[PDB]
Amino acid sequence: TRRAVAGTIKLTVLAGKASPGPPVSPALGPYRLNMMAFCKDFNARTQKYKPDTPMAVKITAYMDHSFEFSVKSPTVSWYIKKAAGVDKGSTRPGHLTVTTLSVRHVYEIAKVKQTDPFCQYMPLESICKSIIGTANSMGIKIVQDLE
Amino acid sequence: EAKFFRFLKIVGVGYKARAEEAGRFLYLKLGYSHEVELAVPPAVRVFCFKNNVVCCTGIDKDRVHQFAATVRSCKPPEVYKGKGIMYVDEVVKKKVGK
Amino acid sequence: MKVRSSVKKMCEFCKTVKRRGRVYVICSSNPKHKQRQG
Amino acid sequence: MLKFLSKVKIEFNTLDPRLASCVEFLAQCNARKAKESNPNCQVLVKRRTDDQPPQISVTFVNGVEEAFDAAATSAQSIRKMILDKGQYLETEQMFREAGEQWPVIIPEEEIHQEAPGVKPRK
Amino acid sequence: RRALLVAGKTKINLQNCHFITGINYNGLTVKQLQELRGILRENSNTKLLVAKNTLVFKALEGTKWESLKPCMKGMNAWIFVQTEDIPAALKTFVSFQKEKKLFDNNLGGAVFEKKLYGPQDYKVIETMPS
Amino acid sequence: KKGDVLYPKRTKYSKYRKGRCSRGCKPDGTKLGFGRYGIKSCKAGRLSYRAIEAARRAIIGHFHRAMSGQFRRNGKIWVRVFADLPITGKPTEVRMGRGKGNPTGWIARVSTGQILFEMDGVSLANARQAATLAAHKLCLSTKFVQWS
Amino acid sequence: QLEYLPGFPRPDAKHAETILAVPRSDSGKNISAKERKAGRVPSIIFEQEDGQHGGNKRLVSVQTNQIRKLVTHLGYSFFLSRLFDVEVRSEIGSDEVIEKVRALPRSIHLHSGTDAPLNVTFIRAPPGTLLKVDIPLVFIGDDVSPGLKKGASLNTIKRTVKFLCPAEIVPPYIEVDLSLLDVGQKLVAGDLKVHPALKLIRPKDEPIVKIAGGRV
RNA sequence: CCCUAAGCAAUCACUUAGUGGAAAAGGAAGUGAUCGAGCGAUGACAACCAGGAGGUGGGCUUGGAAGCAGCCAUCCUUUGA
Ligand SMILES: [Mg+2]
Ligand SMILES: [Mg+2]
Ligand SMILES: [Mg+2]
Ligand SMILES: [Mg+2]
Ligand SMILES: [Zn+2]
């Protein structure tokens, strides 16, 4: 708008548990931000979702304590590790292997990732190859068909 | 008629400036026991304002800039708290003192 | 001022200037980079 | 850059090929670093189909209006000369507020007079 | 190499084109540019490209889009439209402008049938349908 | 070889004549025999085995810090100059002739155009800078040579 | 069948200059130093048919700037495996062309300390003549190699291969593909993809490059 | 040139250090001559303005590492970037 943007700080909060002290303590207190109205607005929208889900919230801080935030889907590392197996990344990715996913989980994860509020127009090939590039970065294997 | 202008800012607890005779004599108080008197040369006059700001005003660019640097050279800015005489647009970078 | 027989530019704000027939390296950022050839 | 102006009026023809300097001054004067520096300063864009040549007409705080040749001088040269006049206006105002007469007059014969070096004295 | 890139980028886009415009993108961010490109790519049959003015100048030579030459100065985002429905092509910018409150980014210049209409002049032609 | 410091384990004779070393060139040109880059000499003179070892240590220590991991030993070094001439020397407070003195060290005779070092398995910039670092330990004037 | 097959490299048209020479009247270090001081490289053009009795030799001198430019741009080995046009005229700027001929640079002498050219040798190679040509190698596909991906290092045993080549189809270089070599294996001189009319002088069981395992 | 017998000798270039008229490794890049290369009116370099993103906070480490303590990978996309 016309307000002098100070910072853009991100966080991950489990769904439904927006109690403003364990993750909403010093993280938002470092930038003088409020803890009540943001938590009310956050709990006024994650009522239709499964709880204990690491929802991504980016909040644009301001000098007049105004919150203008959009809600992001949970992280693609979470989506590609929880739909695969153990959540432990490799000591040496690209050479040491943990899990394996063929073609299908990445494709439907791309379909879910299309629901990002500024991913209305990115093509599914773009999203799928981005997730393939993320999959290369923790050490999981991708094949044509696991059998 | 004057064309060439330069401005100086004085930073300090009890550091003062004053013009004496029609803008031709400059007097300064820089924390010493005595004062500092400088005679402004021809083609240049000096003026003092209410923000500890000294103006060197004149018609010859060489003499104006040389005399402004002359007034600056009486006390350069220190690096630990920036006290002294400096230029208005000049940035002084400090450092912490152990 | 560091006086030596091999002056160099140690960063990107160092300039070589020939003053009175002597080679000086002057720096705006770090005053520890001031060098004189001699 | 926007500290010293009160109103700016930009006028040009959109189908005439000499609008590069005037739209570049539009880019210079409608930046994010500009409008926060003077919230009270006004911009005035006018467009016309007829053949009035593109002009930049500005005013300052102290009632001085200046017209510039936006057809043949570039926006950056305009930006330099507005500040060249602006700092003179600021110096005039700063002298006038303190009780000094403006303009200050110095006899134009001391350029020939010899001057010794200025050595500071006790 | 980038000359060949944008030469191909305009050679593909001129294969079905019928009018061309250029928008002043002063003050528009990357996300709002992407949203304009999205609105005008799904909801219409149009395409957006920001290119070198002299390169489009050289790449439109020898073509019926040779009249454009005055209207290529400053900040130009070239919109090429591969379809014919100019009411739905030009009302999308009205909806975009009135929704996101952007008066600093307007339509400067357009080419239709060897003619450069004024920005006031291609306002009534969006009213007529088909 | 002898690890770092290079001199023969034994020789036919203990003491050798001084000889001359200020002349001599490669009369046919020079080309690299093992590596892609190399350091060759432009002048002719003597080099001691300590200087050759210091230059080799400088090159291998520059590769050690520039490239780590599995590429740390991807750089290969060939030392094509060998020091096999003993030099002698009489101590202080001794008169002129009672024979020949005890040996003190070993030298190598270097001709004009002789390749001292050869490098492979690294980048061109790393090879150039390692040659730059190694030439500051030798008394002779050297040039960087490239395979072509 | 005296033409380059498809799928093979050809000499570039960027470096297809013509070499200009003027006659030289004597041999020896005196006239050689005089020509080098004047700014010319001594040279001789000769043929194969009579090795004794000279060989229909002609003593010429070429331009130092041109020869140095050719050697610097092509490389030392690449200059020696490529044919050139030689035009010998009576004077620089004259039109009295004495001999225009298609020739191979048999050798070039470079100073061991200053690397200025001292001597160029040209051998007449019209079509139908057989030469012993040393062809450089070019190693490609080092990013695709599984052995190099696993951290092994490359051991280039040989850089140039000597062949018997008819003049018309002398390859400028040989492309060697390293896409399908893992740790432990080597390529021998019989794996080079050349023209079938070229005969390998060296035996085929000679290693060229081996990928050896890294220090685990 | 004078000291000192005989030329402020003639033509074409170069240095401005009293080099000439003592001394290296190394440093700086003044001033000429010549051979190439790279960019360039499709607009270069210097200058001014406005952007310089998304997956993503890539994982491992880890009281904390988010592009920027260390290790591995260094991909993919919209794009004008
Ligand atoms: Mg002889
Ligand atoms: Mg006399
Ligand atoms: Mg002297
Ligand atoms: Mg000297
Ligand atoms: Zn510095």
Q: Tell if A106 CB is < 7 Å from nucleic strand H.
A: no
Q: How far apart are CA A132 and CA A141, in angstroms?
A: 10
Q: Token digits for D66? A: 């200046």
Residues, beta carbon < 5 Å, ion ligand 5: C 11, 13-14, 27, 30, 33
Q: In the numeric block, which tokens belong to residue G31?
A: 């006239």
The alpha-carbon radius of gyration of chain A (Å, integer) is 18
E3 touches strand H (CB under 7 A): yes
Ramachandran region of residue G28, left (φ > 0), alpha (ψ -120 to 50) or beta? Answer: left
Of D98, D106, D122, Cβ closest to residue B2 = D106
CA–CA gap between residue B52 and residue B44 (Å, rounded): 19
Residue E120 contacts D, CB cutoff 8 Å: yes
Distances (CA, A) of G55 to B98, E78, G128, G166: 88, 71, 18, 20
Tokens of D44: 């005035």
Q: Which of residues 52-91 of E touch A (CB under 8 A)?
A: none
Euclidean distance between CA atoms E55 and E76, whole angstroms: 12
Which of E32, E34, E46, E102 to substitute to test the interface with A, most A CBs within 10 Å?
A: E34
3-state helix, strand, coil in chain F (%, to 5): 20, 25, 50
Of F138, F144, F148, which is closest to residue F48 (Cα–Cα)? F138
- Name every residue whose Cβ is closer than 8 Å to that of residue B24 and which is 6 or more positions away in sequence: B39, B40, B45, B46
- The CB-side HSE value for B85 (13 A sphere, CA atoms) comes to 20
Beta bridge partners of D67: D57
How many CB atoms within 10 Å of residue F124? 11
Q: Do chains E and G touch (3 or more CB pairs under 8 A)?
A: no
- The residues, any chain, with a CB within 8 Å of residue E27's CB and separated by 6 or more, are D30, D32, E102, E104, E105
- The Å distance, CA of A105 to C1' of H61, is 29
Q: Residue type for G121, please?
A: T
Q: Kindly determine whether the C-beta of residue C14 is less than 7 Å away from any atom of nucleic acid strand H.
A: no
Q: SS3 for E37?
A: helix
Question: Can you read off the two tokens belonging to residue A14?
Answer: 């489990």
**Token pair recorded at residue E82:** 């591969």
* Cα distance between residue F76 and residue F83, in whole Å: 21
Q: Which residues contact G146 (CB under 8 A, 6 or more apart)?
A: G181, G182, G183
Who among residues 61-90 of F has its Cβ near strand H, under 7 Å?
Answer: 68-69
CA E77, CA E25: separation in Å to the nearest integer? 6
Sheet of F37-41: strand order equals F76-79, F115-120, F37-41, F142-146
Instruction: Verify F-B touch: 3 or more CB pairs within 8 A.
Output: no
Could you give the dihedral angle defined by the CA atoms of residues A50, A54, A56 and A60, in that order, rounded to the nearest 10 degrees?
Answer: 110
D and F touch with 3+ CB pairs <8 Å, answer: no
**CA distance linking residue A124 with residue A116, whole number of Å:** 13
How many of the other CB atoms lie within 10 Å of CB of B60?
A: 19
N-terminal to C-terminal alpha carbon distance within chain B: 51
Do residues F7 and F84 make contact, with C-beta atoms less than 8 angstroms apart?
yes
Q: CB contact, 8 Å: F88 with chain G? A: no
In angstroms, the Cα distances linking D102 to B49, D93, D99 are: 15, 9, 9
The separation, in Å, between residue G153 CA and nucleotide H25 C1' comes to 38
Residues A114, A131: Cα–Cα separation, whole Å: 12
d(CA D43, CA D56) in angstroms, rounded, equals 11
Cβ-Cβ contacts under 8 Å, G214 against chain F:
70, 73-74
Gap from G214 CA to chain F (nearest CA, Å): 7
Backbone angles phi, psi at D13, to 5 degrees: -105, 130
Are F126 and F62 in contact by the 8 Å Cβ rule? The answer is: yes
Of D113, D121, D122, the CB nearest to B42: D113
Supply the DSSP string of D42-86, one letter for each residue: EEEEEEESS-PPPEEEEEETTS-EEEE-TTTS-HHHHHHHHHHHH
To which residue do tokens 């928008």 refer? Answer: E23
Q: Which of E15, E5, E10 is nearest to E56 (CA)?
A: E10
Give, as ranges, the nucleotides of chain H with any atom within 7 Å of a protein CB: 17, 25-29, 34-36, 42-43, 47-60, 66, 71-81
- Partners of residue E73 in chain D, C-beta under 8 Å: 17, 19-20, 23
Q: Where are the alpha helices (DSSP H) in G39-191?
A: 64-74, 76-79, 146-149
Question: What is the rounded distance in angstroms from the CA atom of residue F80 to the CA atom of residue F84?
Answer: 13
Asked whether the beta carbons of G69 and G15 are under 8 A apart, the reply is no
* Cα-to-chain-centroid distance, residue G114: 22
Sheet with E107-111: list strands edge to edge: E46-49, E77-81, E19-23, E107-111, E116-117
Rounded to a whole number of angstroms, the CA Rg of chain C reads: 9
Give me the numbers of helices (H) and strands (E) for chain B, helices first please: 1, 7
G81 close to G106: Cβ distance less than 8 angstroms: no
DSSP 8-state assignment for residue G92 = T
Q: Indicate if the alpha-carbon torsion angle D32, D34, D40, D46 is positive or negative.
A: negative
The answer to whether the bond into D39 is cis (omega within 30° of 0) is no
Report in angstroms the alpha-carbon separations of F44 from F49, F108, G114, G215.
16, 11, 13, 38
Q: Which of E73, E107, E117 should one mutate to test binding to chain D, selecting the residue with the greatest count of D CBs within 10 A?
A: E73
Nucleic strand H contact set for A 55-74 (CB, < 7 Å) = 56, 58, 72
Closest residue (CA) to C1' of nucleotide H52 is E30
Query: How far apart (Å, rounded) are the C-alpha atoms in residues B34 and B27?
Result: 11
Neighbours of chain F (3+ CB pairs under 8 A): G
**Distance, CA E109 to ligand 2 centroid (Å)?**
92
Three-state secondary-structure class, residue D3: coil
Distance CA F62, CA G9 (A): 39
Length of chain D: 122
- Cβ–Cβ < 8 Å for G96, G113: no
Look-up of token digits 């073609």: A103
Kindly state whether D106 is in contact with chain B, defined as any CB-CB distance less than 8 angstroms: yes
CA distance E36 to E43: 10
Experimental technique used to determine this entry: cryo-EM
Comparing CA positions, the residue from B2, B9, B11 lying closest to residue B80 is B11
Q: After which residues is chain D broken (C to N over 2.5 A)?
A: none
CA distance A11 to A74: 11
Q: Which of residues 59-88 of B touch D (CB under 8 A)?
A: 59-60, 63, 66-67, 70, 74
| CA distances (Å), origin G105, targets A47, G17, G81, G102 | 84, 13, 8, 10
SS (H, E, C) chain A: CCCCCCEEEEEEEECCCCCCCCCCCCCCHHHCCCCCHHHHHHHCCCCCCCCCCEEEEEEEECCCCCCCCEEECCCHHHHHHHCCCCCCCCCCCCCCCCCEECCHHHHHHHHHHCCCCCCCCCCHHHHHHHHHHHHCCCCCEECCCCC
Q: Is the dihedral of CA E98, E100, E106, E107 positive or negative?
A: negative
Half-sphere exposure of D121 (CA within 13 A, CB side): 9
A92 CA: nearest nucleotide by C1' = H72
The answer to whether the beta carbons of residues B9 and B53 sit under 8 Å apart is yes
Tokens of E48: 């957006």
Q: What's the number of CA atoms in the CB half-sphere (13 Å) around residue D23?
A: 23
End-to-end CA distance of chain D: 43
Q: SS3 of F145, please?
A: strand
Q: Which residues lie closer than 8 Å to A23 by C-beta, 6 or more apart? A: A11, A12, A13
On whether any CB of chain B is under 8 Å from the CB of D32, the answer is: no
What does DSSP assign to residue E14? Answer: T
Helix ranges (H only) for chain B are 61-72
Provide the 3-class DSSP secondary structure of residue F65: helix
Is-contact G4 G10, C-beta < 8 A? yes
How many angstroms separate the CA of D74 from the C1' of H46? 17
- Taking CA D49 as the corner, what is the angle to CA D47 and CA D51, rounded to the nearest 5 degrees? 100
Which nucleotide's C1' is closest to E75 (Cα)? Answer: H50
Please give the Cα distance from F57 to F22 (Å, whole number).
27
Distances, alpha carbon A91 to alpha carbons A9, A94, B69, in Å? 29, 10, 62
Residue C20: count of CB within 10 angstroms of its CB: 5
Cβ <8 Å between D14 and E27? no
- Residue F16: count other Cβ atoms within 10 Å of its Cβ: 14
- For residue E89 the two structure tokens come to 């092509």
Strand order in the sheet with G199-200: G174-177, G130-140, G160-166, G199-200
d(CA G70, CA G117): 11
Backbone φ and ψ for G79, nearest 5 degrees, come out as -65, -25
Say whether the CB atom of D27 is under 7 angstroms from strand H. yes
Does C have 3 or more CB contacts under 8 Å with D?
Answer: no
Tell which residues of chain F come right before a gap with C–N over 2.5 A.
none
Residue A97 in contact with residue A141, Cβ under 8 Å?
yes
Give me the CA D16–C1' H53 separation in Å, rounded.
35
Name, in order, each residue with C-beta under 8 angstroms of G82's C-beta and a sequence gap of 6 or more: G11, G15, G74, G105, G170, G172
Alpha helices in F1-145 (DSSP H): 49-66, 124-134
At how many Å resolution was this determined?
3.0
Which token pair is G116?
């200025």
Please state whether strand H lies within 7 Å of residue A122 at its CB atom.
Answer: yes
**Residues E113, E64: Cα–Cα separation, whole Å:** 8
- Rounded Cα distance, B91 and G26, in Å: 75
Say how far apart CA G118 and CA A16 lie, in whole Å.
Answer: 85
Q: Rounded to whole angstroms, how far apart are CA atoms F147 and B60?
A: 65
Least Cα distance to F84 among F54, F48, F137, F115 occurs for F48
* Nearest in space to G104 (alpha carbons), one of G175, G19, G180: G19
Tell me the DSSP string of G167-213. GGG--S-EEEE-TT--TT-EEEGGG----TT-EESS-S--EEEEEE-
CB atoms within 10 A of CB A124: 12
The kind and range of the H/E element at G122 are strand G117-124
Among E93, E89, E91, E118, which residue's Cα sits nearest to residue E103? E93
Query: Rounded CA gap, F78 and F120, in Å?
Result: 9
Two structure tokens written together for D48? 């016309």
Contact B36 D94 (CB under 8 A): no
Buried b (16+ CB within 10 A) or exposed e, F45-72: bbbbbebbbebbebbeebbeebbeeeee
Classified as helix, coil or strand, F103 is: strand
Q: Map tokens 């910072």 to a residue.
A: A7
Residues 4-33 in A having a C-beta less than 7 A from any atom of strand H are 10-12
Quick one: CA torsion of G106, G111, G116, G122, rounded to 10 degrees?
A: -10
Distance CA A120, CA A122 (A): 6
CA separation for the pair D110, F1 (Å, rounded): 84
Nearest CA-CA partner of G21 in G108, G166, G112, G121:
G121
Q: With an 8 Å Cβ cutoff, is A1 touching chain E?
A: no
The answer to whether residues G204 and G194 touch, using CB atoms and an 8 Å cutoff, is no
G65 touches strand H (CB under 7 A): yes
Contact call for B47 and D95, based on CB within 8 A: yes
Could you say which of B36, B42, B47 has the minimum Cβ distance to residue D115? B42
Distance from CA of B80 to the nearest CA of D (A): 25
A13: which 2 tokens?
A: 């909060």
